[PDB]
Amino acid sequence: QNFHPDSEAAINRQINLELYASYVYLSMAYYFSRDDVALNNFSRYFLHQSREETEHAEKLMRLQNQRGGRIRLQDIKKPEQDDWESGLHAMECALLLEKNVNQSLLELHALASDKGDPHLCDFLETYYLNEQVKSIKELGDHVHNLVKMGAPDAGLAEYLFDTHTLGN
Template sequence: MLKKEMVDALNKQINEELYSAYLYLSMAAWFDSIGLNGFSNWMMVQYKEETDHAMKFFNYLSQQGEPVKLMAIKEPPNSWESPLHAFEETLKHEQHITACINELVDLAEKLKDRATYNMLQWFIDEQVEEEANDREIIDILKLIDGSKNGLFMLDRELAQRQYTPEI
């Protein structure tokens, strides 16, 4: 049985993960609207992964016999100054999610909730990967420095990313 404080925090994290999915879906739509279908594909994969992350928390609460409380999801932005700006915002958002996960780990330690602590280890590793992926694309976009040929080549590369279910 989880303590109420942990149940509330995990329900809040479901909302954070669903907002992440919503944000990446919005970015996919924006990239599609400016003709960068590969970038759009990359964000659609992110959208699906973030939905999986929300479901990991959802399923964990259900398995623990705790109530899942879905909350309103705030509206995400719907345009960005450039592909670089979009990815800088993506990194900033992932850093926020990393902080949220770290707070959950701290709470699990404080409450001596070993099961939740163990479950959260997957998310710690996932956040390292998420931030590294964003930094890599940001670095490439900075190297491209507005080159249409470079942007075209990166768009083609990002189009190759495929979704692999995580749950």
């Protein structure tokens, strides 16, 4: 009922993108626990973000089932980098990733609106759009502090951010 095939396909594309974001964050988590990086709270922060993105994917899979769509999985592409360079660079990449995921969600909302699917619009507004705004704000805050503190070249900056902001 009232579930357009274009919407089914776009949900499937969004599932893949959430799974990709999970993998990017998993890659970052294990970069920060290398013996030549060793920022354990950066590692834990990105591991938590990876697990949140898996939940984002699962909620969309549940939506497909609830609405009678067919889940169609695709390969989860590897992250663009295996070496994330620094805590600052990884935060900047995460910020760009979250902005790109947000744009995809806003395009999905525009499609649902065009198709007169208020249930899908509300689902996105309730579980996705504000979550993306808060995540982009948080990552922007982190980038700003790391830049101001002198990261990555100032030797104390990433260490102190790891211990204070990401320690909690």
